Design a protein around this ligand. Structure first.
Ligand code: HH2
Ligand code: HH2
Ligand code: CL
Ligand code: CL
Ligand code: CL
Ligand code: CL
Ligand code: CL
Ligand code: CL
Lengths: 273, 273
C-alpha cells in the first residue's frame, strides 16, 4: 500500500506589538494553533519566526530565537509526541532548535546563507529541506524571472546543494528537496506550473520531495484571485503534487489539503490484486 | 495553448410538493439557479428531471417533461446563448429537449434504456454522453461490485456503445464517453480511483471524455466523510481528471471546481517556447 503524504502544518510566530513584553500571550496562542493543526491531521508542526517571502523583514538571530524558543519549549512539553520542524537559515537558530528536539530544519537558502548550518544538522539526525530560490538572499523578491528551462536550472541547483550537504556530513536519506514555488522561482506563474508538471523528474536525485503551494502567487489564475480565493487552487496544486511524487505538503489549510491529497494518494494506489 | 475544461453545471428540477400545481414557483427558482451557475463559470447548464443515483425514484416520461420543459423554455428565452444539456434516457424526453434547443443529451444508460434514443440524437447535431453503468437499470443500485480489471470492463463497454451509437447514425465527433464514477461503477470506492488513474487509457477510443466526481460516495475517504465534507476531495478528483484527459467536468460546485481545474489545465500547459 502506498504511504500517505505527510502534511506539514505552518505555525508562524509573528509578535503582535513588536515592542518589549507581551510575548507570554503570543506563546499561549501559538500552542493553541499548534493543537488545532494536529487535530486537523498535520503530521509535522513547522515553527518559524522569520518570514522569507517578498516584502518580509530580516530579523536578527536573537530575535528569531526569542520568538520560537518559548514556542518549541511549550509544544514539546505538553505535546511531546509531535514532530517539530523549524523554518530557519541561521546555524545558531538551528542548533538551539535541534537541542530542544526539532526533527527537521527547513532552510530557504539551501545552506547558502549560513555556511555553518549544514554541519549543525550533520551533528544530529535531523532532516533538512533544501529549497530552490532564484535569489541568494533567503528573503525572496518580486521579480518576473525567466528561464530557458526552469526544470534543468532547479534540477542542477538541487543536485549541487545535495552534494554540498553530503560533503558536510548529511546522508542522502536525511536530505529533502524542494523545487520552490511562487516568487521563490519566479513572479511569472508559468514556471511554478512547469515544475509541478515535471516534479517526478526530480526523483532521480534520490531524495524525498517537499512542496508548499499554500495559496502562493501563482495560484491567482486568470481571475487574479487573491489569497482568500486560492483554497480550491491550493487543493488541486497540492493533490497533483502528491500524484507527481510529493512526499511532504506544507500548507495553512491542513484539514482541506490533507483530505484532497488523500484522494491523490488513493488514485496513485494500484488495486489490492 | 491547451484548451480549458468545460464545466457542466448541474440543475436538477425536483418538485417541492409532488402534488398538483405550484410548478410556476419551481420554474422561477430554477432560472435563478441557472443564472448563478453561469455567473460562477459554468459552460453548460445540465437540466435533468429524474435522479438516477441509488435510492432514486423512476418517473414517467410525462412527469419528466412536465418538470424540464418549462425550465428549458424559460432559460432559452432569457438566456438564449447558454448551451443546455438534458440528463435523460428516454427518447421522447430527448426529442422534445432537442426541439427546444438542447445541444447535448446525457444518457446514464448509454442508449440501452430506450432503443430509440440513439436515432433521435442522430437526426440532430446534439452531442450525446454515454456513461458506463454496472446495471442495465438506469437507476444505479447500492452494490459493492468487484472487477478483475475495472478498466478493461469499462473500456470494452464504452467501445461497443460507441459502435452501437455510430451504427445508429451518430458520428464519432458527436459522442462523449463517461467511464462513470461512484455507485455507477461500484460501491467499493477503489474502482472509481482506478478509473481516474487510467483515464488517459480511454483516449484511444477517439472521443471527448466526460467525468463527474461531484461529491460522490467514493470521496468519503478513511474519515467516512459525508457530502458536506467532500468539496476538497471533489476539487482534487476533478483536477486530476482534467490532468488525465477529462474534457468535461460535471459538478455542483462550479466556482471552486472550475478554479481548481484551471490549475490542472495550467499544469498540463507546456511553456510558450
Ligand atoms: N520549503 C519551503 N519553505 C517555504 N517557506 C516559506 C514560504 C512562503 O510561502 P507562503 O505560502 O506565503 O507561506 P507563509 O505565509 O508562512 O510565508 N514558502 C516556502 C516554500 O514554498 N517551501
Ligand atoms: N454522465 C454522468 N451523469 C451522471 N448523472 C447523475 C449522477 C449522480 O451523481 P451525483 O454526484 O450524486 O449528482 P446528483 O446529485 O445530481 O444526483 N452522476 C452522473 C455521472 O457521474 N456521470
Ligand atoms: Cl536561464
Ligand atoms: Cl532535466
Ligand atoms: Cl502574492
Ligand atoms: Cl469482472
Ligand atoms: Cl485496456
Ligand atoms: Cl453517498
Amino acid at each position: 500500500g502506498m504511504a500517505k503524504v505527510k502534511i506539514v502544518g505552518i505555525l508562524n510566530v509573528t509578535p503582535n506589538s513588536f515592542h518589549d513584553g507581551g510575548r507570554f500571550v503570543e506563546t499561549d496562542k501559538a500552542v493553541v494553533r499548534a493543537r488545532e493543526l494536529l487535530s486537523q491531521g498535520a503530521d509535522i508542526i513547522e515553527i518559524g519566526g522569520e518570514s522569507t517571502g517578498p516584502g518580509s523583514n530580516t530579523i536578527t538571530a536573537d530575535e528569531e530565537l526569542a520568538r520560537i524558543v518559548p514556542v518549541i519549549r511549550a509544544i514539546r512539553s505538553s505535546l511531546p509526541d509531535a514532530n517539530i520542524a523549524v523554518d530557519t537559515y541561521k546555524a545558531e537558530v538551528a542548533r538551539k532548535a535541534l537541542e530542544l528536539g526539532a526533527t527537521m530544519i527547513n532552510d530557504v537558502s539551501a545552506g547558502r546563507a549560513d555556511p555553518k548550518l549544514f554541519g549543525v544538522v550533520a551533528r544530529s539526525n535531523a532532516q533538512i529541506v533544501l529549497m530552490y530560490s532564484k535569489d541568494t538572499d533567503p528573503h525572496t523578491s518580486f521579480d518576473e524571472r525567466q528561464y530557458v528551462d526552469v526544470v534543468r536550472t532547479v534540477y542542477d541547483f538541487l543536485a549541487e546543494r545535495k552534494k554540498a550537504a553530503m560533503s558536510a556530513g548529511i546522508p542522502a536519506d536525511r536530505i529533502i528537496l524542494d523545487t520552490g514555488l511562487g516568487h521563490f522561482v519566479s513572479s511569472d506563474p508559468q514556471y511554478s506550473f512547469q515544475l509541478l508538471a515535471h516534479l517526478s523528474d526530480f526523483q532521480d536525485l534520490g531524495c524525498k520531495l517537499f512542496l508548499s503551494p499554500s495559496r502562493k502567487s501563482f495560484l491567482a489564475g486568470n481571475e487574479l484571485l487573491k489569497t482568500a480565493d486560492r483554497l480550491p487552487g491550493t487543493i488541486a496544486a497540492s493533490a497533483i503534487a502528491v500524484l507527481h511524487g510529493a512526499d511532504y505538503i506544507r500548507t495553512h489549510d491542513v484539514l482541506e489539503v490533507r483530505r484532497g491529497c488523500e484522494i491523490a494518494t488513493a488514485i496513485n494506489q494500484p488495486p489490492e490484486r
